[PDB]
């Protein structure tokens, strides 16, 4: 009668270490009266392991050193099965069935739809957004096109590809978008490859760096404003937390082992309640437009005139004991343990919904 | 020496299972046996993977109804994170010899919608066709249309129903917005699966309820009056468009249209292909109206691929034979995989 909850954390991605802490804190807060946890740790190589609750993290208390303890057991997944989908990769030995997955691998394979495709192929119910929404929210160019098309406010931008890169002069980009500009790879994370640009020198450098990381580079108008974030929860009836503020300054990737890169975070945002509600309602619209499920964190710019400009949507936000997404809910009447539970319930409901659908 | 191993993934838990069975047989039958060894990776209708043997993998192979995948002893499991021996015997862990490329030809639900591509991406397996986002986006007609309209391309005017808003609009409200007749389709599904033409209210409530048994979003569109033309696109970054073909009240290749129209449709296919981020191949299906407007209906990232299907017939009518189309798709897969590996991670 207790559901086995498989927490998938770690990963090849550069956010590996923040993933380890998100996992530690979920493991610590999860209602042990309803759920048994199984630790499904992914290596920096991308291989899956079943870790032991007592011995899974090597420097749990030390962000710049924390690590996932090596394992004998590697895992494989068996497509089309409905039980025992996860096995020992050396010998076929089955793991007991996991009833739901809680993926908390930030970035590269966990947030971009890839992991979600695998879990869908394994008939594993899972927390959060599915393939399309996850892939779409990770491609900044696509997400923005979807937002613009929904009528929502977005930084004016253009997208460079390998085949139009040189169509645009710096003058041309400057005439289109004004200065300063931000230049980023379409598919990254944690400001890696993001540069702000005030002249043609910078611009050309900016573009070359970003093309080291993706085949599409987004170049957008600089927005002046506070950075406000909001936590959305639900499937068909999305609810918005109160808003929170993040303060990033230009003075310092050299700290992508701390969530939000150690920026100043304050919850609730010291903004008026009617602005807070306005951002809340926009966050739900955004959520809807990107087809998100389970949860998402919506990050916006709030300009001097209280215009709200959507910057990012993150489908697997940081989930440490002091990360923005859970604190926002905690400030809104929903505690960590109960948040975790709600996320699991939503995952199982959506799975039931999907399963009931006809195939022919 | 030794040739590239091509794993053809086919079959699947999908309405289009039998079509996939055929696309695969034709691919197996035509692939250049001097360059490639095929490994047959058949997915039964329950969605489980097997290694099949090419001398005896289909039952009633020659009969378009009754064609079935022969049941197999070996079921398969995938090992995330490995760059070799990613596919193993799911009973005992024995690895298959490592496949060099995957040719996915599972039409519809999991094979065409990004799920399979996401699995292949995690297994570091090079693969033919469009990647995770593009496959998922082209399969969701609602998203594909919104992206096409954002690019300035013509699509059928539409509304999208969800379980929460489906009762907002009356037949009368829809009709004032979109005219009659209407087409009601699940957002995500293959070939005509829950699609209905609607001319009155009873038809509408019926059609909408039906599409909602196949998906959680339903597109309701204005019926477009025109000829149905298709175009095959091939490539990654500098893609090429075949000559066009037509479906008639019957497939006609080449479509009997002036050259200017052929080129207009062709250039639009490529724009649609770029807007949706497709890779390898797609078939772009359009309506050509009385005044030569081109309205995009569908972008298919894994189109029917029997040697008689539209996509291959369009290339043949443009000077590219079926064996050679197969080879070019495999080498585009490999070129894309190498370009993706050159991207830096830090
Ligand atoms: N258009 C913009 N105007 C102002 N600041 C921006 C703009 N784009 C990015 N930034 C700044 O750069 C940071 C990282 O950009 P973002 O697009 O969020 O990248 P990431 O996805 O890596 O978090 C933002 O949090 C913000 O401070
Ligand atoms: N909006 C429309 N206007 C006119 N005819 C349509 C429209 N939508 C669909 N049809 C007709 O119905 C057929 C099936 O719809 P389609 O979107 O092609 O479904 P599928 O993607 O499942 O093949 C089309 O090939 C076309 O003949």
XYZ file of C-alpha atoms and ligand atoms in Angstrom:
760
model
C 0.000 0.000 0.000
C 2.913 2.583 -0.069
C 3.754 3.941 -3.571
C 7.342 3.522 -4.661
C 8.559 6.922 -5.788
C 11.658 6.877 -8.008
C 13.657 10.110 -7.769
C 15.771 10.536 -10.857
C 18.574 12.962 -10.195
C 22.164 13.830 -11.155
C 22.852 13.612 -14.870
C 25.494 14.551 -17.469
C 24.385 18.129 -17.323
C 26.290 20.959 -15.750
C 23.507 21.302 -13.152
C 24.389 17.820 -11.801
C 25.386 19.174 -8.413
C 22.264 21.303 -7.959
C 20.314 18.126 -8.950
C 22.036 16.214 -6.162
C 20.748 18.813 -3.649
C 17.301 19.043 -5.017
C 17.221 15.206 -4.540
C 18.566 15.324 -1.019
C 15.917 17.747 0.042
C 13.048 15.869 -1.678
C 14.268 12.656 0.009
C 14.205 14.435 3.297
C 10.747 16.103 2.978
C 8.721 13.341 1.264
C 5.877 11.896 3.400
C 7.364 8.508 4.415
C 3.857 7.520 5.511
C 2.567 7.419 1.925
C 5.713 6.857 -0.081
C 8.761 4.603 -0.241
C 11.639 6.308 -2.091
C 14.019 4.630 -4.468
C 17.133 6.629 -5.462
C 17.725 6.532 -9.128
C 21.014 8.374 -9.516
C 22.480 9.317 -12.874
C 26.303 9.636 -13.259
C 28.143 12.381 -14.931
C 28.495 9.845 -17.753
C 24.717 9.423 -17.995
C 24.406 5.935 -16.590
C 21.610 5.091 -14.173
C 22.079 3.457 -10.744
C 19.935 2.444 -7.818
C 21.548 4.155 -4.856
C 21.282 3.362 -1.162
C 19.595 5.962 1.034
C 22.365 6.140 3.614
C 25.223 6.093 1.104
C 24.379 8.095 -2.018
C 26.073 11.452 -1.571
C 29.782 11.890 -0.707
C 29.945 15.557 0.483
C 26.277 16.270 1.079
C 27.089 19.529 2.935
C 29.456 21.160 0.417
C 28.050 22.453 -2.938
C 31.455 22.776 -4.700
C 32.432 19.153 -3.646
C 29.167 17.148 -3.350
C 29.113 13.958 -5.378
C 27.112 10.877 -6.198
C 28.640 7.706 -4.715
C 29.695 5.180 -7.374
C 27.556 2.087 -7.792
C 27.955 -1.522 -8.844
C 24.363 -1.762 -10.195
C 23.672 -0.094 -13.580
C 20.122 0.133 -14.858
C 18.352 -0.519 -18.117
C 14.760 0.278 -19.067
C 12.468 -2.175 -20.870
C 10.171 -0.620 -23.475
C 6.482 -1.447 -23.455
C 6.477 -3.191 -20.079
C 3.977 -2.013 -17.377
C 5.746 -3.559 -14.404
C 9.330 -4.234 -13.597
C 10.320 -1.743 -16.322
C 13.659 -1.106 -14.721
C 16.255 -3.811 -14.529
C 19.848 -4.537 -13.678
C 21.737 -3.866 -16.951
C 24.381 -6.576 -16.298
C 22.024 -9.509 -15.706
C 18.403 -8.664 -16.379
C 17.500 -8.813 -12.699
C 14.312 -6.734 -12.199
C 13.958 -3.966 -9.701
C 10.703 -3.880 -7.835
C 8.224 -1.764 -9.810
C 8.443 1.991 -9.365
C 4.906 3.482 -9.251
C 5.918 7.072 -10.189
C 9.048 8.921 -11.198
C 10.013 12.296 -9.827
C 12.629 13.608 -12.320
C 14.788 16.351 -10.940
C 17.704 16.333 -13.397
C 17.967 20.011 -14.413
C 19.018 20.899 -17.918
C 20.275 18.737 -20.654
C 18.564 15.426 -20.639
C 16.062 15.739 -17.907
C 14.462 18.979 -18.879
C 14.497 18.842 -22.686
C 11.954 16.108 -23.361
C 14.454 13.233 -23.728
C 13.997 11.682 -20.337
C 10.235 12.222 -20.643
C 10.242 10.221 -23.929
C 12.029 7.324 -22.274
C 9.603 7.314 -19.337
C 6.625 7.486 -21.645
C 8.133 4.463 -23.546
C 8.476 2.617 -20.199
C 4.876 3.417 -19.120
C 6.311 5.043 -16.054
C 4.118 7.745 -14.580
C 6.096 10.927 -13.948
C 6.048 14.331 -12.339
C 6.022 17.419 -14.498
C 5.802 18.435 -18.125
C 5.776 15.923 -20.924
C 7.881 15.653 -24.133
C 6.608 18.510 -26.225
C 6.308 21.067 -23.397
C 9.680 20.172 -21.951
C 11.438 20.297 -25.320
C 9.623 23.596 -26.216
C 10.426 25.370 -22.901
C 14.102 24.366 -23.302
C 14.317 25.921 -26.822
C 14.199 29.592 -26.147
C 13.528 30.451 -29.776
C 10.463 28.153 -29.990
C 9.047 29.045 -26.568
C 9.280 32.748 -27.480
C 7.604 32.232 -30.840
C 4.787 30.415 -29.051
C 4.483 33.212 -26.512
C 4.499 35.977 -29.131
C 1.852 34.059 -31.040
C -0.341 33.844 -27.874
C -0.191 37.677 -27.641
C 2.056 37.680 -24.533
C 4.949 40.051 -23.955
C 8.416 38.937 -24.898
C 11.739 40.697 -25.458
C 11.972 41.567 -29.183
C 14.505 39.174 -30.703
C 15.931 37.379 -33.755
C 17.307 33.882 -34.032
C 20.459 33.097 -35.850
C 20.981 29.781 -37.454
C 23.985 28.371 -39.251
C 22.394 29.275 -42.577
C 21.276 32.944 -41.821
C 24.061 33.889 -39.416
C 25.661 36.302 -41.777
C 22.462 37.742 -43.300
C 22.503 40.126 -40.331
C 24.983 43.011 -39.912
C 25.582 44.335 -36.372
C 24.168 47.541 -37.690
C 21.097 45.621 -38.854
C 20.643 43.966 -35.455
C 21.245 47.296 -33.721
C 18.680 49.030 -35.923
C 16.170 46.262 -35.180
C 16.575 45.875 -31.429
C 18.487 48.832 -29.955
C 21.307 48.383 -27.446
C 22.167 46.681 -25.186
C 21.421 43.213 -26.543
C 21.677 39.816 -24.928
C 22.966 36.959 -26.954
C 22.365 33.313 -25.893
C 22.307 29.788 -27.279
C 18.677 28.671 -27.859
C 19.067 25.603 -25.711
C 21.157 26.123 -22.630
C 20.846 26.922 -19.001
C 22.271 28.857 -16.100
C 23.477 31.838 -18.095
C 26.244 29.666 -19.761
C 26.873 31.298 -23.146
C 24.766 34.354 -22.327
C 26.557 37.664 -22.975
C 25.346 41.192 -22.871
C 26.416 43.313 -25.810
C 26.906 47.103 -26.148
C 28.944 47.164 -29.438
C 29.913 45.336 -32.628
C 33.101 43.831 -31.173
C 31.190 42.353 -28.283
C 28.392 41.221 -30.558
C 30.647 39.189 -32.827
C 32.343 37.582 -29.910
C 28.928 37.006 -28.243
C 27.628 35.209 -31.311
C 30.630 32.978 -31.800
C 30.545 31.837 -28.157
C 26.820 31.005 -28.271
C 27.287 28.988 -31.502
C 29.802 26.819 -29.596
C 26.860 25.526 -27.577
C 23.877 25.339 -30.004
C 23.017 25.614 -33.717
C 20.625 28.422 -32.963
C 21.496 31.611 -31.145
C 18.913 34.056 -29.799
C 19.724 37.743 -29.813
C 17.270 39.915 -27.931
C 16.563 43.471 -26.829
C 17.738 44.305 -23.261
C 14.846 44.806 -20.854
C 15.229 47.009 -17.809
C 13.289 45.749 -14.832
C 13.156 43.663 -11.685
C 13.331 39.901 -12.137
C 10.267 38.376 -10.654
C 9.458 34.651 -10.535
C 6.266 32.725 -9.889
C 5.549 29.055 -9.183
C 2.722 27.354 -11.144
C 1.234 24.056 -9.961
C -1.347 21.758 -11.648
C -2.467 19.992 -14.867
C -5.856 21.224 -16.002
C -6.383 23.862 -13.275
C -3.064 25.606 -12.924
C -2.568 27.611 -9.731
C 0.019 30.413 -9.260
C 1.955 30.948 -6.088
C 2.782 34.384 -4.827
C 5.771 35.991 -6.603
C 9.432 36.056 -5.550
C 12.343 38.333 -6.502
C 15.765 37.394 -7.799
C 18.572 39.933 -8.078
C 21.399 39.115 -10.520
C 24.252 41.510 -10.923
C 26.837 41.808 -13.570
C 29.908 41.432 -11.293
C 30.556 37.676 -11.539
C 29.178 29.862 -14.679
C 31.829 30.016 -11.958
C 28.995 29.055 -9.457
C 26.636 26.691 -11.388
C 26.991 24.252 -8.445
C 24.657 26.550 -6.399
C 20.983 26.953 -7.322
C 20.058 30.284 -8.872
C 23.887 30.698 -9.040
C 23.848 32.084 -5.512
C 21.856 35.197 -6.517
C 19.884 37.191 -3.931
C 16.423 35.631 -3.553
C 13.511 37.148 -1.606
C 10.143 35.588 -1.093
C 7.591 37.151 -1.263
C 8.616 39.828 -3.759
C 8.426 43.255 -2.191
C 5.987 44.457 -4.862
C 2.378 45.524 -4.556
C -0.278 42.844 -4.438
C -2.062 44.030 -7.548
C 1.232 43.801 -9.500
C 1.796 40.387 -7.856
C -1.656 39.293 -9.115
C -0.991 40.622 -12.523
C 2.232 38.561 -12.790
C 0.410 35.537 -11.412
C -2.292 35.658 -14.101
C 0.419 36.133 -16.845
C 2.364 33.163 -15.479
C -0.677 30.908 -15.836
C -1.234 32.127 -19.414
C 2.392 31.355 -20.174
C 2.049 27.950 -18.586
C -0.956 27.226 -20.749
C 0.593 28.452 -23.923
C 3.600 26.164 -23.457
C 1.443 23.078 -22.589
C 3.181 22.584 -19.232
C 2.023 19.994 -16.704
C 2.654 19.365 -13.041
C 4.775 22.456 -12.318
C 6.797 25.231 -13.875
C 8.613 28.321 -12.734
C 7.894 31.383 -14.804
C 10.546 34.135 -14.693
C 9.583 37.645 -15.911
C 10.958 41.163 -16.070
C 8.803 43.873 -14.333
C 9.588 47.188 -15.880
C 9.459 50.614 -14.229
C 5.969 51.011 -15.654
C 4.834 47.592 -14.372
C 4.876 46.039 -17.853
C 5.531 42.334 -17.511
C 7.868 40.698 -20.032
C 8.255 36.898 -19.952
C 11.859 35.732 -19.893
C 11.997 31.983 -19.165
C 9.821 29.030 -18.344
C 11.555 26.247 -16.439
C 9.841 22.852 -16.207
C 12.145 21.289 -13.637
C 13.188 24.144 -11.396
C 15.626 23.872 -8.523
C 14.030 22.033 -5.657
C 16.439 22.421 -2.758
C 15.208 23.338 0.705
C 15.897 27.022 -0.126
C 15.184 27.088 -3.876
C 12.728 29.530 -5.268
C 9.991 27.150 -6.505
C 9.299 25.421 -3.095
C 9.804 28.634 -1.101
C 7.239 30.366 -3.270
C 4.708 27.703 -2.445
C 5.685 27.636 1.249
C 5.004 31.419 1.289
C 1.666 30.682 -0.329
C 0.322 28.136 2.193
C 1.719 24.958 0.737
C 4.620 23.314 2.555
C 7.379 21.227 1.061
C 6.077 17.874 2.050
C 2.552 18.649 0.819
C 3.989 20.142 -2.444
C 5.859 16.904 -3.115
C 2.631 15.000 -2.535
C 0.535 17.194 -4.758
C 3.153 16.766 -7.523
C 2.889 12.997 -7.226
C -0.921 13.038 -7.244
C -0.966 15.209 -10.354
C 1.506 12.866 -12.066
C -0.677 9.761 -11.362
C -3.886 11.534 -12.478
C -2.346 12.607 -15.754
C -1.039 9.149 -16.331
C -4.580 7.746 -15.837
C -5.892 10.342 -18.243
C -3.308 9.410 -20.901
C -3.826 5.709 -20.415
C -7.543 5.858 -20.933
C -7.104 7.330 -24.457
C -7.851 5.154 -27.479
C -5.114 4.047 -29.823
C -7.387 2.966 -32.743
C 36.304 -4.848 -43.311
C 32.798 -4.470 -41.884
C 29.730 -2.425 -42.795
C 27.524 -0.011 -40.854
C 24.801 -1.662 -38.853
C 21.399 -0.075 -39.462
C 18.687 -0.841 -36.922
C 15.256 -0.403 -38.483
C 12.705 0.241 -35.774
C 9.240 -0.661 -36.907
C 5.786 -1.831 -35.878
C 4.755 -0.130 -32.648
C 1.742 0.299 -30.352
C -0.065 2.458 -32.811
C -3.008 2.616 -35.187
C -0.437 2.677 -38.023
C 1.297 -0.609 -36.928
C 0.567 -2.487 -40.174
C 1.655 0.487 -42.286
C 4.951 0.493 -40.362
C 5.308 -3.231 -41.009
C 5.109 -2.487 -44.708
C 7.335 0.564 -44.724
C 9.948 -1.639 -43.032
C 9.663 -4.531 -45.439
C 10.144 -2.196 -48.364
C 13.134 -0.577 -46.605
C 14.636 -3.977 -45.803
C 13.950 -5.105 -49.399
C 15.627 -1.972 -50.966
C 18.501 -0.990 -48.668
C 21.963 -1.113 -50.197
C 23.220 -4.476 -48.966
C 26.749 -3.676 -49.911
C 26.967 -0.715 -47.517
C 24.787 -1.821 -44.667
C 23.728 -4.752 -42.534
C 20.204 -4.513 -41.278
C 19.174 -5.395 -37.798
C 15.435 -5.634 -37.431
C 14.083 -4.057 -34.275
C 10.336 -4.839 -34.324
C 7.966 -3.404 -31.746
C 4.907 -5.616 -31.163
C 1.547 -4.050 -30.644
C 2.042 -4.074 -26.849
C 5.081 -1.807 -27.398
C 7.816 -4.253 -26.506
C 10.935 -4.429 -28.629
C 12.496 -7.527 -30.184
C 15.332 -8.516 -32.484
C 13.781 -10.248 -35.414
C 15.436 -12.245 -38.202
C 15.082 -10.995 -41.774
C 14.474 -14.413 -43.278
C 11.304 -14.877 -41.272
C 10.094 -11.734 -39.386
C 6.646 -11.192 -40.893
C 3.560 -13.396 -41.174
C 1.314 -12.949 -44.230
C 3.948 -10.562 -45.523
C 2.213 -10.548 -48.907
C -1.276 -9.690 -47.548
C -1.875 -5.992 -46.595
C -4.492 -6.978 -44.023
C -3.196 -9.943 -41.925
C 0.462 -8.805 -42.168
C 1.829 -9.363 -38.690
C 5.154 -9.307 -36.903
C 6.293 -12.827 -36.089
C 6.490 -13.277 -32.308
C 10.114 -13.429 -31.061
C 11.975 -14.953 -28.045
C 14.394 -12.057 -27.420
C 12.794 -9.012 -25.860
C 14.958 -5.871 -25.552
C 15.925 -3.228 -23.017
C 17.931 -0.008 -23.534
C 20.923 1.054 -21.299
C 21.003 4.868 -20.762
C 24.386 6.495 -20.917
C 26.310 3.848 -22.872
C 27.868 4.676 -26.186
C 28.190 1.017 -27.142
C 25.981 -2.024 -26.554
C 23.038 0.200 -25.698
C 20.554 -2.530 -26.571
C 20.550 -5.705 -24.480
C 18.555 -8.877 -23.970
C 15.990 -7.805 -21.368
C 15.949 -11.283 -19.775
C 19.607 -11.748 -19.143
C 21.527 -8.621 -19.998
C 23.338 -9.997 -23.096
C 24.121 -7.024 -25.341
C 23.345 -6.934 -29.022
C 26.256 -5.897 -31.124
C 26.217 -2.139 -31.245
C 24.003 -0.602 -33.959
C 25.640 2.393 -35.818
C 22.333 4.117 -36.875
C 18.642 3.799 -36.302
C 16.062 4.141 -39.080
C 12.819 4.798 -37.194
C 9.717 4.001 -39.148
C 7.130 3.697 -36.412
C 4.384 6.068 -37.646
C 2.285 7.886 -35.070
C 2.146 7.651 -31.328
C 5.476 6.948 -29.848
C 7.707 6.692 -32.831
C 6.739 9.885 -34.547
C 6.088 12.161 -31.590
C 9.483 12.651 -30.014
C 9.325 9.876 -27.445
C 11.384 7.426 -29.404
C 13.738 10.151 -30.470
C 14.235 11.053 -26.810
C 15.112 7.476 -26.005
C 17.547 7.312 -28.906
C 19.098 10.581 -27.883
C 19.715 9.238 -24.348
C 21.188 6.021 -25.820
C 23.572 8.131 -27.944
C 22.163 6.367 -31.022
C 22.417 8.281 -34.302
C 19.040 8.358 -36.053
C 17.144 9.238 -39.191
C 14.645 12.007 -39.239
C 13.614 14.834 -37.044
C 14.721 15.149 -33.437
C 12.730 15.401 -30.212
C 11.180 18.904 -30.396
C 10.530 18.975 -34.097
C 8.905 15.530 -34.104
C 6.718 16.440 -31.068
C 5.788 19.801 -32.549
C 4.902 18.483 -36.010
C 2.787 15.791 -34.443
C 0.740 18.336 -32.398
C -1.301 20.041 -35.070
C -2.194 22.789 -32.664
C 1.474 23.677 -32.072
C 2.631 23.190 -35.627
C -0.116 25.571 -36.802
C 0.724 28.225 -34.305
C 4.369 28.096 -35.327
C 3.497 28.237 -39.026
C 1.135 31.167 -38.482
C 3.869 32.919 -36.401
C 6.227 32.454 -39.412
C 3.662 34.204 -41.694
C 2.659 30.985 -43.565
C -1.005 30.165 -44.339
C -2.847 27.646 -42.235
C -6.578 26.845 -41.962
C -8.228 29.245 -39.470
C -8.935 27.302 -36.286
C -9.784 26.978 -32.655
C -8.362 24.503 -30.218
C -10.543 22.814 -27.639
C -9.285 21.519 -24.312
C -11.252 19.572 -21.697
C -11.750 22.879 -19.768
C -12.968 25.060 -22.633
C -14.765 22.631 -24.841
C -18.194 23.837 -23.703
C -17.274 27.572 -24.047
C -18.044 27.478 -27.769
C -21.416 26.517 -29.258
C -21.704 25.094 -32.729
C -23.234 28.513 -33.593
C -20.211 30.376 -32.141
C -17.622 28.184 -33.933
C -19.608 28.541 -37.165
C -19.729 32.311 -37.017
C -15.984 32.238 -36.539
C -14.957 29.601 -39.082
C -17.809 29.014 -41.574
C -18.975 25.544 -42.628
C -18.000 22.874 -43.254
C -15.519 22.315 -40.431
C -12.899 19.605 -39.815
C -12.552 18.326 -36.238
C -9.329 16.402 -35.443
C -7.501 15.290 -32.320
C -4.354 17.434 -32.058
C -2.070 14.341 -31.915
C -2.859 11.329 -34.016
C -1.963 9.842 -37.378
C -3.685 9.470 -40.721
C -7.327 10.493 -40.378
C -7.667 8.606 -37.171
C -10.358 10.649 -35.349
C -11.039 13.211 -37.993
C -14.575 14.208 -39.045
C -16.081 16.628 -41.478
C -18.856 18.571 -39.852
C -21.787 20.410 -41.462
C -24.290 20.757 -38.591
C -24.581 20.753 -34.833
C -25.191 17.051 -34.298
C -22.225 16.300 -36.470
C -20.198 18.717 -34.319
C -20.974 17.411 -30.854
C -20.383 13.914 -32.169
C -17.079 14.784 -33.884
C -15.763 16.655 -30.806
C -16.617 13.906 -28.375
C -14.902 11.417 -30.702
C -11.650 13.435 -31.065
C -11.492 13.662 -27.304
C -11.179 9.905 -27.012
C -7.920 10.066 -28.899
C -6.290 13.236 -27.368
C -6.746 15.915 -24.692
C -6.788 18.698 -27.333
C -8.968 18.902 -30.377
C -8.482 21.170 -33.385
C -11.542 22.531 -35.135
C -10.744 24.073 -38.549
C -12.295 25.821 -41.429
C -12.724 23.562 -44.417
C -10.324 24.739 -47.162
C -11.479 24.461 -50.788
C -8.634 23.307 -53.036
C -6.455 20.668 -54.654
C -4.466 18.455 -52.331
C -0.757 18.652 -53.176
C 2.166 17.013 -51.475
C 5.880 17.744 -51.540
C 8.786 15.721 -50.202
C 11.625 17.526 -48.394
C 15.026 15.997 -47.889
C 18.055 17.170 -45.917
C 19.261 18.939 -42.755
C 20.533 22.532 -43.152
C 20.202 23.038 -46.876
C 17.134 21.068 -47.653
C 15.799 20.184 -51.127
C 12.157 19.869 -52.256
C 10.954 17.159 -54.672
C 8.515 17.931 -57.412
C 4.944 17.980 -56.122
C 2.287 15.241 -56.344
C -1.513 15.378 -56.091
C -4.213 13.274 -54.397
C -7.404 13.237 -56.491
C -11.106 12.200 -56.087
C -5.900 8.348 -56.641
C -2.224 9.605 -56.543
C -0.866 11.590 -59.519
C 2.906 12.186 -59.752
C 3.973 14.786 -60.898
C 1.051 16.988 -60.066
C -0.278 18.672 -63.202
C 0.357 22.227 -62.210
C 2.258 25.037 -63.828
C 5.959 25.234 -62.966
C 5.500 28.475 -61.062
C 3.016 26.836 -58.767
C 5.247 23.777 -58.381
C 8.087 26.070 -57.316
C 5.822 28.163 -55.037
C 4.621 25.083 -53.148
C 8.186 23.725 -53.076
C 9.602 26.937 -51.521
C 6.773 27.013 -48.984
C 7.471 23.366 -48.014
C 11.012 24.323 -47.256
C 9.918 27.308 -45.205
C 7.514 25.058 -43.254
C 10.381 22.530 -42.824
C 12.664 25.233 -41.404
C 10.041 26.797 -39.187
C 9.351 23.464 -37.534
C 13.041 22.528 -37.196
C 12.740 19.259 -39.205
C 15.771 17.119 -40.032
C 16.334 14.361 -42.567
C 12.939 14.268 -44.268
C 9.373 15.358 -44.128
C 6.299 15.400 -46.345
C 4.461 18.643 -46.494
C 0.785 18.447 -47.442
C -0.965 21.566 -48.688
C -4.168 22.874 -50.221
C -3.835 24.853 -53.399
C -6.839 27.161 -53.689
C -8.542 28.410 -56.898
C -6.447 31.537 -56.779
C -3.162 29.665 -56.182
C -2.939 30.355 -52.530
C -1.083 27.661 -50.625
C -2.507 26.599 -47.283
C -0.472 24.105 -45.171
C -2.435 21.188 -43.669
C 0.185 18.709 -42.244
C 3.956 18.284 -41.827
C 4.764 14.588 -41.515
C 8.239 13.766 -40.124
C 7.940 9.959 -40.695
C 5.761 9.641 -43.787
C 4.624 6.326 -45.263
C 7.742 4.849 -46.790
C 6.765 1.825 -48.812
C 8.197 1.939 -52.375
C 4.681 2.831 -53.496
C 4.056 5.645 -50.880
C 3.952 9.312 -51.778
C 7.258 10.423 -50.186
C 9.482 7.957 -52.129
C 7.393 8.259 -55.313
C 8.017 12.037 -55.252
C 11.746 11.552 -55.061
C 11.678 8.957 -57.819
C 9.757 11.316 -60.061
C 12.496 13.887 -59.325
C 15.446 11.591 -60.142
C 16.167 9.942 -56.768
C 15.660 6.230 -56.494
C 14.447 4.440 -53.413
C 17.745 2.636 -52.473
C 19.569 5.887 -52.855
C 16.986 7.863 -50.852
C 17.575 5.319 -48.043
C 21.325 5.817 -48.196
C 21.048 9.558 -48.217
C 18.765 9.539 -45.135
C 21.301 7.341 -43.234
C 24.175 9.648 -44.127
C 22.182 12.757 -43.110
C 21.584 11.042 -39.736
C 25.334 10.516 -39.330
C 26.267 14.003 -40.397
C 23.755 15.478 -37.910
C 24.969 13.263 -35.085
C 28.602 14.389 -35.735
C 27.549 18.073 -35.876
C 25.721 17.629 -32.563
C 28.719 16.032 -30.875
C 30.926 18.978 -31.828
C 28.797 21.318 -29.744
C 30.597 22.122 -26.489
C 29.014 21.214 -23.152
C 31.294 23.602 -21.119
N 16.483 40.536 -22.773
C 17.082 40.723 -21.566
N 17.019 41.900 -20.843
C 17.593 42.027 -19.644
N 18.257 41.028 -19.055
C 18.364 39.826 -19.636
C 17.798 39.615 -20.976
N 18.059 38.343 -21.332
C 18.779 37.794 -20.326
N 18.957 38.672 -19.318
C 19.736 38.428 -18.080
O 20.568 37.243 -18.202
C 20.155 36.252 -17.267
C 20.221 34.852 -17.916
O 19.345 34.895 -19.061
P 18.264 33.701 -19.341
O 17.693 33.956 -20.730
O 17.421 33.531 -18.084
O 19.312 32.469 -19.447
P 19.238 31.105 -18.570
O 18.170 30.381 -19.396
O 20.634 30.607 -18.795
O 18.747 31.357 -17.122
C 18.726 36.682 -16.888
O 18.348 36.144 -15.648
C 18.777 38.209 -16.923
O 19.325 38.870 -15.752
N -9.184 22.002 -42.988
C -9.488 21.185 -44.033
N -10.037 21.587 -45.199
C -10.314 20.723 -46.200
N -10.084 19.407 -46.095
C -9.513 18.880 -44.972
C -9.176 19.769 -43.881
N -8.653 19.055 -42.884
C -8.674 17.772 -43.333
N -9.164 17.682 -44.578
C -9.291 16.424 -45.354
O -9.265 15.315 -44.443
C -8.073 14.518 -44.623
C -7.492 13.963 -43.317
O -7.069 15.036 -42.458
P -5.546 15.194 -42.045
O -5.307 16.506 -41.322
O -4.741 14.906 -43.320
O -5.472 13.992 -40.970
P -4.128 13.093 -40.686
O -3.026 14.012 -40.174
O -4.691 12.246 -39.553
O -3.787 12.464 -42.058
C -7.135 15.453 -45.375
O -6.148 14.729 -46.102
C -8.101 16.201 -46.245
O -8.494 15.336 -47.284
